[PDB]
Structures are given as C-alpha cells and as structure tokens.
Design a protein around this nucleic acid. Structure first.
Lengths: 117, 109, 49, 101, 205
RNA sequence: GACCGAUAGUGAACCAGUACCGUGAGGGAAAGGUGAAAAGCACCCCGGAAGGGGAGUGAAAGAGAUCCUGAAACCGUGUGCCUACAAGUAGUCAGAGCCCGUUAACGGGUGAUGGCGUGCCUUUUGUAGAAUGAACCGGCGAGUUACGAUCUCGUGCAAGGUU
RNA sequence: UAUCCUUGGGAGUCAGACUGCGAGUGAUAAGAUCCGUAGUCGAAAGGGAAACAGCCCAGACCGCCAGCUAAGGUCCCAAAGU
RNA sequence: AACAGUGGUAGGAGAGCGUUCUAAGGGCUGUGAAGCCAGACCGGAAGGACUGGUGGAGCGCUUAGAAGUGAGAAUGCCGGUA
C-alpha cells in the first residue's frame, strides 16, 4: 500500500518549535534555523554544564582570598596551613559560607596561622 | 459596542493603515472631521464605513452620538489580485493588486 | 494457539535493512557505499571477472 | 548549624530546614543519620578530620526524588554525528531535627 | 482421542476412538505458524500497478536548455521529483504464494487437529441428516449443542442440503471432508465433525 | 483488490485533450466537498453600490456561495517584562529586579549584568570560511521487484530430499 | 599480559597533511616534493601557546554549587606567591 | 554481587521507535472519534500519554504480516507568502 506523509512532520516540527520559544525573531518561528539553534543550544548547554563547576570554583576562591587577605594572610599560605593543620575536609563552598559567617572564618584562620609556626 | 467591517475593499492595506492609525483611540465626532479633512486615498472609504459603524445605533442597541469613542480598530488583508504587467526583454513581470479588510469597533465612554 | 497470539520461531525472522534513511541507523547520506567510487553510482558494478 | 560531607560534597545544614541531597539507601519515611560530622557551629567545636563523638546528625527523609529532565544533546558539526540522551538525577528530600554536638 | 459422541438433539452416546497418529500428535508451533502464513499470503491476489516514469503520457522533450539558464538542470517534464508524476519502485503486479513440502503440510494439519483435540473443542456429530434446508432448525440444533462463538462443520455427504442452510451465518461455513485447511480450522475455534468424515480424513492422513 | 483517496490515482473525478502555446508536426495544464433539507438569508439601519450591522432559518451564520476542518510562512491589534554609552552566529549558564501562579514541582514569563562561544549541509589533508546549496512555509521527492546463484539463520524429513 | 591462527559472510579505503629524527632533489630555500621511522590530525572534543587540525598536556557513557593534579602559570585584565 | 569498559568518519553488527493497510482477540466513540490549537506530564532515544479549546464522524489497543514507511539541503518540483 501507500503511506502518506501525515501528521508525523507536524508533530516533530511542532515539538522543536515549541521547545524553541524566546529566541530572536525568525529563530523562534522558522524551523530551518530554529533547529539549527537547538543543537547549538544543546552543545552550549553541555559545555557550560561542565564549565559551571570551574567558574563557581573561581568565585569561591576569590572570595576566600579576600577573606584571607583581610586577616593579613595569603590564600595559598592559608590552605597550606590548613592542610598541615589537619585533614581539613572543609572545602571551598562551606568556607565561603564561613565568610558569610566571618567570625567563624576568623576562628579557623587564626588556628591555621598559629599552627603554621 | 458596535462593529462594522469592510470585507475586501480594493485598496492596499498599507496605504489604508497610514491614514487609518491616526484615528486610533479618540472621540468619534472629531475623528470623522480630521479624517475627511485629511486628503488620502483611504479617507473616503474609512469615512464611509465609520459612519456605518456609528449608524449601528438606529435599528440597533441604543447608544448616543456624544460620549462615544473608538475602542479599537484595524486594517486586515484580503485576497490579492494577481496581475501580469508586461515588461522589457519580454520578461513579463508580476504585480499584486491588494485588497483589504477594515475593522472598526466603537464603544461608549 | 489462536491468531491473536501468533508467535514465530525465534531466529527465523529478520528485519529488513532500510538503507539511506536517517543517520542514527548508520548508512545515511552515502547509504553505506563510501564516496565518489565507480561502484558508488547507480548500475556502477564492474563485470564479475 | 553543622557541616555534613554526605554524598561526596559537604552541605551546610541548620536545625529545622530542608535540603535536597543525593538519594540514599533509606526508605522515604524513616529518619537517617550522618556520622562524618564537622564544624558544629554555635560554640563551634571543630577539629581537623574531627572525631566529635555523639555529634551525628539525625534527619528524617521524606522523598524518593527524581529531578527534572535535562535533554543532553551532542553533535559534532559537518560530520553527521548525533547523540541525544535524556537524563534525570535521583535525589532525596531530607528534613533535619536534633543537631548533635 | 476418546471424544464422546453426540446426537442431533444434544443427546450423548458412547465415546469414539480416534487415530493417535493424526489426533494425538504433539503439535509443532512453528510449523502451524508457517502453514498459517502460507495460505494467508496465498489468499491475497496482489493486483496493484502504478505508472513508472517511462509510461506516464508525456515527458518527451527537454523543457529547457542545460546551461545559460537560471533554472536547475532538468530532464523530462514527467520525472520523479517533478509534480506531474512518475513514481519509482512502486508496487508491481506479482504473486504472493509459494509451496511447502507434503510432509510439512500434513504435519501442520495433523498438529492443528491434535491441538483442537487437546484443548477439547471437537464435537462429533454422527449421521447429520436434515430433511429441509431451513435455517432456524439447525440454529436450534446448535443452541441445543451449546455453541455460541464461531464454528465449522465438515459433513461430506449431506452437504447439498446443509450448505444452503448454514451459509446464512457470516461467521459459520460448511466445508467438505476433502477441503480441510488451517485458517478455517484455527479461526472457527469449534470443529464440528461427522464420523464418516472422521474415517475419511483418517484414511486420507 | 493486505489498489489511489484529489501535488495520489488516467493528462483528464470538475464541459480535457479543453483553456493556452506553436504557422505546423506537436506540446499541454490548473480547477472535488454549504446544509439532511435551500429551509440560501423576509424585514430594519448605514450606504450609490459592494460590504456590513441587526431580525429570521438551522443542530450549527464562527455554515451565507473556494461554503466541512482551516496548520505554517506572512501580516495586523491590545498588552505582562525589558530597551536610547552600546558594537557581538544572537545562544547557553550564572544572575538581581519585576510580572504571573502550574499536567505542583527543588514552578512559569521577562530578563539589567558577567563568563564562554565564528550557522546547517556537501566536498575536502584542511571550511567560520572570502568554496558550494538553500528567501521562507507546506506538500511531493531517491536502494524495490522479478528470475537465478551464494551464505547465514530457522524449520520438515533425513541417505535420502522433492515435485 | 591475553591476543593469535584457519574458514566463511559484508565492507570502505588507493588525493593525505603537519611536527620530530634519518636521507634524496633543490641553492643542505620553501607551509616545496619524494622516501624510512615516531606521534597527532585525519576520525579527538577539553587545558595551555591571544585567536589556531596537526606544537605541549590529556581522551569526553551521563549528572554534582566535590577534592587532587599534567602542560602552563600565580601585579591586574584573569585564578593562584608584589 | 564483583571486575573491567562505554570519543568517533568511512564502515560492519545488535537492539529498537514511528506511519498506512491487512487478519486475530479485546473496546473507543454525538454523554463528541479522527484532525487542529495550547499546556509547567512520562520514557535512554526515535517518541507516548493526560487536561482544556476547536472539530462534527470515524479510530485506538493486543499479536503477527505486508510496505509507494520516516526530508533540511539535490542552482530539486508545485502552491502560497515575504
């Protein structure tokens, strides 16, 4: 028998056009370039899903650096002192929260400094 | 709350919209005045159907001539007349003679 | 066994290989024939000897 | 408030909040405890890899979660390479009671 | 192979011994399947022809020159991508039947009859005599024999009067004792037989 | 009829070998659908009409002469958020503010600002390429069948198998 | 350590490029050509060298607001020692 | 359970998804099917439900078979519109 090109084209193209709301102009209404955006969007999504770890780490690091320098300490010497102070399993996120609870951060910093020598 | 439509009057919709947008949202009794005193192609047509629009009060639900305003109104395209204008080198170029739908919806305030 | 529970002998039925349909199955644009070859065109076979 | 290393990444936790963390082996109605505790806060008893005895953190778990779909799409251009894979990450909703120091 | 014998009005008699080699054989599912598929394909006639490019009333001339024209290079107006038609690898008129060995088909029919025996939908009706071709009589006969779904009746000699009467039902058909197949046997789910046709098919097999 | 259901199926479901093109031989289209019944809009108002608004018929008037349904390109009208010191394959992810509240779920829209980031396909050793193709949207559009051969798999018989 | 041989079914490939080292031809010129040998690209994304296929480090089954690190780097842009 | 693995073009193999008919069994439909339109739902994928609005008569499911069976590109073709 003969199979016609029925509803399947409408369904598949409408799925991606539905997923592609909010794009600029023709990119949110025309399939030929809307589809061309979404694989670009998928690749950018994967890449920055792995890149979010590193720039968040950088944000935590510079906040920790500010917290160390305003207690008169370099960040590198701070973590060195922490590591020989013990297995400081406390890590960058919750040290950042210790900056937002800064007195506790002071209470860690002086311990690391006094252990350093 | 009265409505009248043009339903394929032979005029380009853009040339309609240019004189058509300037009466959007102002009192009808002076809107008809500014529109029949601006010289455009579209002005007599919109004049005609606008007077029909206010004229939907006689054998109609009752409003009155004053305190009455255009609520919303727009120009909408109709089917286009395909025409083939002959052109040099025997090229036979193609021209579109457009038609338009003109809507007026008028409510009291 | 009635008709609405038909079971063939397993391993005695094989799906056909529809070449040149999409890319996920493989055999896509080129339909599994490589590139630019004499064999790659329609009727492109050589004499068997 | 204390620091619980939990599933390979420590979460700051306070008494009375709720936290979304990775899906444990416990069932969705029974309270669970985290033993490897550090930085008890308040009077902030804190040691390097601290053996703070009696400071495990009781916590009631009420969900067997499955997070929202991230449609992971791969393609390498000009090469007819495609790889689409859906993904949901499991989790558990935990409320916390009786912080111990 | 020891099915009880029934009479016209639903009365039962002494049970009938049946051939073990025909009705006690362990059925072969794959063989029954292939025999089903065999004549299932054989029933269809497959008449369908669609006009190939070379025979679509037109084409002929080249529509425009190859080079020096902004249009793409193109052959005859009747062409596959062309709107007017010319289809490629369409359905062709051809045969959808083949053949199976005698041993295989006899094994298949023995398998399906024996399967009917082991799930007990065989009812044997000896000496099925009806003096008129009226339908409501055998309708009452079947209601007395307590059959509700489809059925198949095989009687060899009384066929000339039964065949007019029983052909009324869409789902019920007579068959001769010779014409036993697989689709009619499986589909009709309740095989009505007479003892004369029992011995006839018995010696045939 | 395990044939098509109006870009299909005859070129031709429709006044088609017509219209149209060619001097002539010849070539050769597009174009189906109100309603069950026309019961197809009495009557009123605007207007020259067309066209509308009412009233009426119907189960439906958004059903009123391409008149079943009416997708998309395209074009309009109100708006929730944002925009006049900013250059950005126009995304993604962080992200404050604002608006809304859902197939209730670690919600939805918009997004000031930051980081990263040169479309798709083909062909190439190599393409963001200043190599090629695509104005867009919709439809159609490319490995099948016949007869043999071979191999695997699975079946029935097996020194026999088979028409 | 576990990959080797035989047979059978089914292919594509015969335009390669660059960087090392060992040669030709060339003017021991070429992002030149042609060989042997090793790697990478080809067909391999990520970090570095500003951007970059072949250079250096290193292989992407997915997710995490986890840690340690190779090349390279730590005044700032821009993370880390003025 | 443990161990190991899971870049990828040509290619080769295995699993599948979907469409139209056809039989078998089951049922859905004017108390509104198909189709269309909109949603913040489900699966690893192709995709599949649920709820509204339109629509005003046909259609799923189960298992098997047979295919004119899956479009983004061919200065493709036709229609419509920039």
């Amino acid at each position: 028998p003969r199979v016609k090109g029925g509803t399947v084209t409408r369904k598949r193209r409408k799925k991606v056009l539905k997923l592609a709301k909010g794009y600029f102009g023709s990119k949110h209404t025309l399939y030929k370039v809307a589809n061309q955006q979404v694989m670009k969007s998928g690749n950018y999504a994967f890449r920055d899903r792995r890149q979010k770890k590193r720039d968040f780490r950088k944000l935590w690091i510079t906040r920790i650096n500010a917290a160390a320098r305003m207690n008169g300490l370099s960040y590198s010497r701070l973590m060195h002192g922490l590591k020989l102070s013990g297995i400081e399993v406390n890590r960058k996120m919750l040290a950042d929260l210790a900056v937002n609870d800064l007195t506790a951060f002071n209470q860690l910093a002086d311990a690391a400094k006094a252990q350093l020598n | 709350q009265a409505k009248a439509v043009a339903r394929t009057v032979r005029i380009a919709p853009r040339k309609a919209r240019l004189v058509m947008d300037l009466i959007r949202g102002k009192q009808v009794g002076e809107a008809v005045s500014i529109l029949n005193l601006t010289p455009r192609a579209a002005s007599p047509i919109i004049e005609k159907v606008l007077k029909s629009a206010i004229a939907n009060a006689e054998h109609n639900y009752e409003m009155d001539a004053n305190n009455l305003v255009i609520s919303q109104a727009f120009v909408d395209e109709g089917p286009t007349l395909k025409r083939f204008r002959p052109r040099a080198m025997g090229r036979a170029s193609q021209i579109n003679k457009r038609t338009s739908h003109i809507t007026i919806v008028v409510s009291e305030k | 066994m009635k008709l609405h529970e038909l079971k063939p002998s397993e391993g005695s039925r094989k799906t056909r290989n529809r070449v040149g349909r999409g890319i996920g199955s493989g055999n896509g644009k080129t339909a599994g024939k490589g590139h630019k070859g004499q064999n790659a065109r329609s009727g492109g076979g050589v004499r068997p000897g | 408030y204390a620091i619980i290393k939990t599933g390979g990444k420590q979460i700051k936790v306070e008494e009375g909040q709720t936290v979304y963390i990775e899906k444990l082996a416990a069932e969705a109605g029974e309270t669970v405890t985290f033993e490897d505790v550090l930085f008890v806060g308040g009077d902030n008893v804190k040691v390097g890899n601290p053996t703070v005895e009696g400071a495990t953190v009781t916590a009631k778990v009420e969900k067997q979660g499955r997070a929202k779909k991230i449609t992971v799409f791969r393609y390498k251009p000009k090469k007819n390479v495609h790889k689409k894979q859906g993904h949901r990450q499991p989790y558990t909703k935990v409320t916390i009671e009786k912080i111990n120091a | 192979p020891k099915v009880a014998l029934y009479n016209q009005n639903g009365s039962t008699a002494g049970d009938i011994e049946l051939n073990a080699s025909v009705f006690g054989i362990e059925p072969n599912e794959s063989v029954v399947f292939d025999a089903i598929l065999m004549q299932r394909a054989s029933l269809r006639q497959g008449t369908h022809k669609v006009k190939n490019r070379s025979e679509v009333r037109g084409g002929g001339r080249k529509p425009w020159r190859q080079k020096g024209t902004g249009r793409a290079r193109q052959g005859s107006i009747r062409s596959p991508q062309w709107r007017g038609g010319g289809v490629v690898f369409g359905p062709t008129p051809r045969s959808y039947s083949y053949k199976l060995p005698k041993k295989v088909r006899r094994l298949a029919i023995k398998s399906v009859l024996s399967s009917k025996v082991i799930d007990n939908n065989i009812i044997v009706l000896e000496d099925l005599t009806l003096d008129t071709a009226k339908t409501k009589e055998m309708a009452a006969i079947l209601k007395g024999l307590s059959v509700e779904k489809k059925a198949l009746i095989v009687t060899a000699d009384a066929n000339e009067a039964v065949a007019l009467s029983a052909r009324n039902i869409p789902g019920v058909t007579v068959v001769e004792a010779n014409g036993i197949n697989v689709l009619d046997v499986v589909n009709h789910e309740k095989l009505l037989i007479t003892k004369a046709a029992v011995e006839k098919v018995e010696e045939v097999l």
